[PDB]
Each structure stands twice: as structure tokens, then as C-alpha cells.
Design a protein around this ligand. Structure first.
Ligand SMILES: Cc1cc(/N=N/c2ccc(C(=O)Nc3ccccc3N)cc2)c2cc[nH]c2c1O
Length: 125
């Protein structure tokens, strides 16, 4: 296919380890962005076939989306909160480097990123 397999979301051999930062990332950060009116383009991996972006996966080396992030948090895939924050950053970067400024998708990403950064400013210690 033109699309890669979706990013892995489970680590069967990683110990289960909770942190209050990971709790905050799921219950505050992800939850707030997931319910936002602009979340929908970001709730699943980019399907370059259905969306007619044939060059997407030639330009975007590390695909990322909030559906993947949500499942990773639910599955305790991340060893630490910084790994999760990096995935959010990657998702936004992909959008900004692939799409044209002023495309509706970019304005939607920017609104979500603003909310993301506001919540990250209150990440517990
Ligand atoms: C991250 C990202 C996502 C992108 N579109 N993601 C979409 C997802 C669902 C949809 C969708 O269900 N649309 C709909 C709306 C009302 C009723 C039915 C449907 N099927 C569209 C785009 C695009 C497009 C261009 N660059 C994109 C990009 O960088």
C-alpha cells in the first residue's frame, strides 16, 4: 500500500509504570484535545490514499496522530511523559511542514497546538 502500517501502540514486555505526568497527559491533555471541535483530522493516522496525498509518506518520516497517542497512553506504552510530548510535537510538525500555510488543516492544528502548549505549561512536576 501507499500507507505504512500504523505506529505500534502496545509494548507487551515493558513493565507497567504510572506517573502523575502520564496521568495528566491522558486525563487532561489528550482528553481536552480529543474533544475539541478541530480534533477530527488528527484522531487517526493520515490515509494518503483516501485523502489523495500520494507524496505524504515520502515527506513525512515519522507519522503521528492523536489516535495513536491515545492508545499508547491507554496501553502504558510510554516510559515517560516526555516521549508522549514528543509525539504531540511530531504530529504538529508533520502538519506544518507538509501542508501550505493558510490551509484549513494548518489553522486547525495551530488551534490544537495552542491548547496543547497551555496544558503542558501546567504539567505536574
Ligand atoms: C493531519 C492531516 C489530516 C488531513 N485530513 N484528515 C481528514 C480526516 C477525516 C476527514 C473526514 O472524516 N471528513 C468528513 C467530514 C464530514 C463528513 C464525512 C467525512 N468523511 C477528512 C480529512 C489532511 C488533509 C490534508 N492534509 C492533512 C493532514 O496533514
Amino acid at each position: 500500500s501507499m500507507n505504512p502500517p500504523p505506529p505500534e501502540t502496545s509494548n507487551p514486555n515493558k513493565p507497567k509504570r504510572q506517573t502523575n505526568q502520564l496521568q495528566y497527559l491522558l486525563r487532561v491533555v489528550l482528553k481536552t484535545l480529543w474533544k475539541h471541535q478541530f480534533a477530527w483530522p488528527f484522531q487517526q493516522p493520515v490515509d494518503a490514499v483516501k485523502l489523495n496525498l500520494p507524496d505524504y509518506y515520502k515527506i513525512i518520516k515519522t507519522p503521528m496522530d492523536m489516535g495513536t497517542i491515545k492508545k499508547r497512553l491507554e496501553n502504558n506504552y510510554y516510559w515517560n511523559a516526555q516521549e508522549c510530548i514528543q509525539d504531540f510535537n511530531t504530529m504538529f510538525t508533520n502538519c506544518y511542514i507538509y501542508n501550505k500555510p493558510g490551509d484549513d488543516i494548518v489553522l486547525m492544528a495551530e488551534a490544537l497546538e495552542k491548547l496543547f502548549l497551555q496544558k503542558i505549561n501546567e504539567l505536574p512536576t
